[PDB]
Amino acid sequence: PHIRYAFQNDKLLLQQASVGRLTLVNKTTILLRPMKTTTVDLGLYARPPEGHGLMLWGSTSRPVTSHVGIIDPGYTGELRLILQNQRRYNSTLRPSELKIHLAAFRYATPQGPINHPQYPGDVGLDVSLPKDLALFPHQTVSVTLTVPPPSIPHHRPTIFGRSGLAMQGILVKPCRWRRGGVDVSLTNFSDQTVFLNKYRRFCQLVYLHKHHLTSFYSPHSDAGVLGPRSLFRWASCTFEEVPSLAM
Ligand SMILES: O=c1ccn([C@H]2C[C@H](O)[C@@H](COP(=O)(O)O)O2)c(=O)[nH]1
Ligand SMILES: O=C([O-])[C@H](O)C=C([O-])O
C-alpha cells in the first residue's frame, strides 16, 4: 500500500521517510508557556491506503507531553501536533529536541457508553463518561471502564484522546482496553479547574489489528504511543510524495 503525502514547512526538517514511518524534526527553538496549549502547524498532508488510518505522535526527552493523534481516512486538511508543558515555568525545545512521527495502521469498526463513528469511515467511537469528574490544574484524574466493548476477532480495543479536549489542556494517556477493564487517566495541564459531567464524550475507542501490538523493539516499532508494555508496530507502507495534496 502507498501513503500519499505533501510536506512544506521551512521551520521543520524531514529527517527520513523509511520502513513505513515519516519523521520530522524542529529546526528552530519551540517555546512552551506554562498552563497553555502549544500547537505546531506541520504543513503536512496525507491520505492512507484503503483499510488504514494514520497515527501522529511527538517524542522528546524534555519535560513536554504531546497528544497522540488518530488521523481519519477521509481527512484532507493540514495535520497539527498539540503539546503541553509539564512544568510550571517556560520550557523550550531547542533545535532537534522534538521528533514528530507519522505512520499507518489497519483498523476495524463495529456497528452509551459507546457511540457510532461521527462520519463515514472514521476510525474511533466516542465513549461516554460514567460519572461527573472535577479536574484541578496540573493534576491527574483516573476513571475505570469495566463493561466490555464489542468483540472483534483479530483486533484489539484501545483508548486514545480526542483533539478538542487536548486543545483545552486535557490529555488522555493512551492504553489497551484489556479483558479485565481499563483505568483511563486524564491530566489537566491548564490553569483552570475543568468539570466533565456524566455522559460527556471524554475519549475514543479504536480497534487496531493485532499485528499492530507487539513486545519487540523493531525498526517497525516504537515505545512512544501506548507506552512500554505494548509497543505500536506500524504497517509496512511506502510513502509517496504528491505535492498537489498541499493546500
Ligand atoms: O493530533 C492530532 C489529532 C487529530 N488531527 C486531525 C485529523 C483528525 O481526523 C481530525 C479530528 O481528530 P479528533 O478530534 O477526532 O481527535 O483532526 C490532527 O491534525 N492532529
Ligand atoms: O473530524 C473528523 O473526524 C474528520 O475531520 C473527518 C473527515 O472525514 O474529514
Domain chopping of the chain, boundaries: 1-108+210-247, 109-209
Pocket of ligand 1 (CB under 6 A): 56, 67, 69-72, 75, 79-80, 82, 162-164
Distance of CA 95 to the CA centre of its chain: 23
User: Do 1-108+210-247 and 109-209 share a fold?
Assistant: yes
2-7 and 238-241 beta bridge pairing: parallel
Report H helices in 52-160.
none
Is 164 annotated as belonging to a binding site?
Answer: yes
Which residues have CB under 8 Å from 114's CB, separation 6+? 125, 126, 127, 128, 149, 150, 205
Q: How was this structure determined?
A: X-ray
- Give the integer Cα–Cα distance in Å for 42 and 72: 17
- Give the integer Cα–Cα distance in Å for 212 and 107: 9
- Give the integer Cα–Cα distance in Å for 236 and 197: 41
Query: Quick one: fold of 109-209?
Result: Deoxyuridine 5'-Triphosphate Nucleotidohydrolase; Chain A (2.70.40)
- Give the integer Cα–Cα distance in Å for 101 and 238: 15
Resolution in A: 2.0
79-85 and 37-47 beta bridge pairing: antiparallel
Helix (H) or strand (E) holding 165: helix 163-167
Under 8 Å between Cβ of 61 and 16: no
After which residues, if any, is the chain broken (C to N > 2.5 Å)?
111
- Give the integer Cα–Cα distance in Å for 141 and 234: 30
Proximal ligand: closest to the CA of 120: 2
Cell numbers of 90, please? 517556560
Domain covering 1-108+210-247: architecture: Distorted Sandwich (2.70)
